[PDB]
Design a protein around this motif. Structure first.
Motif, PDB file in Angstrom:
ATOM      1  N   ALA B   3       0.797  -1.220   0.000  1.00 40.05           N
ATOM      2  CA  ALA B   3       0.000   0.000   0.000  1.00 40.05           C
ATOM      3  C   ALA B   3       0.833   1.275   0.000  1.00 40.05           C
ATOM      4  CB  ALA B   3      -0.934   0.010   1.211  1.00 40.05           C
ATOM      5  N   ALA B   4       2.164   1.178   0.037  1.00 39.06           N
ATOM      6  CA  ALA B   4       3.000   2.371   0.135  1.00 39.06           C
ATOM      7  C   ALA B   4       4.168   2.424  -0.838  1.00 39.06           C
ATOM      8  CB  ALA B   4       3.549   2.484   1.553  1.00 39.06           C
ATOM      9  N   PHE B  11      -0.650   2.356  -3.625  1.00 35.30           N
ATOM     10  CA  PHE B  11      -1.523   3.510  -3.373  1.00 35.30           C
ATOM     11  C   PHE B  11      -1.056   4.811  -4.014  1.00 35.30           C
ATOM     12  CE2 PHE B  11      -2.876   7.151  -0.838  1.00 35.30           C
ATOM     13  CZ  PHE B  11      -4.241   6.997  -0.906  1.00 35.30           C
ATOM     14  N   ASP B  12       0.215   4.874  -4.389  1.00 34.33           N
ATOM     15  CA  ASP B  12       0.840   6.160  -4.635  1.00 34.33           C
ATOM     16  C   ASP B  12       0.990   6.382  -6.122  1.00 34.33           C
ATOM     17  OD1 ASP B  12       1.019   6.628  -1.894  1.00 34.33           O
ATOM     18  OD2 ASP B  12       2.988   5.676  -1.751  1.00 34.33           O
ATOM     19  N   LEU B  15      -3.010   6.647  -6.918  1.00 34.45           N
ATOM     20  CA  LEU B  15      -3.607   7.947  -6.652  1.00 34.45           C
ATOM     21  C   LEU B  15      -2.956   9.027  -7.506  1.00 34.45           C
ATOM     22  CD1 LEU B  15      -5.614   9.611  -4.939  1.00 34.45           C
ATOM     23  CD2 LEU B  15      -3.850   9.834  -3.252  1.00 34.45           C
TER      24      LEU B  15
END
Lengths: 51, 51
Positions: B3-4, B11-12, B15
């Motif tokens: 997620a990072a 996620f990055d 997004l």
């Protein structure tokens, strides 16, 4: 399995969480040491050993 | 899975894709509206000069 949270509506804006207890968790030598330091919580040496 | 950090599944990247995508929307919409300005003022010169 870092129980992260997401906060920001932009990237990287996350949190880290730490959750570790269990009934097999007691005195933190490193882990369940042996019959002691986890398992007096579990096995409870007070049977007749304690006599 | 992550997620990072992996920069594809974290996620990055994602997004960021949404962000710049929406910014492409913005840019093109600005172009279209700019054209509409030119066409309004253009019809004004056409209509009054033509008058």
């Amino acid at each position: 399995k870092n129980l992260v949270f997401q906060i920001g509506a932009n990237a990287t804006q996350q949190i880290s969480v730490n959750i570790e207890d269990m009934g097999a968790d007691a005195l933190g030598i490193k882990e369940a040491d042996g019959s002691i330091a986890a398992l007096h919580s579990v096995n409870d040496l007070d049977v007749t050993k304690f006599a | 899975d992550n997620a990072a950090d992996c920069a594809d599944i974290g996620f990055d990247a994602q997004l960021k894709v949404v962000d710049e995508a929406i910014n492409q929307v913005s840019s093109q919409r600005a172009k279209l509206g700019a054209v509409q300005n030119r066409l309004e003022h253009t019809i004004n010169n056409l209509s009054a000069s033509g008058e």
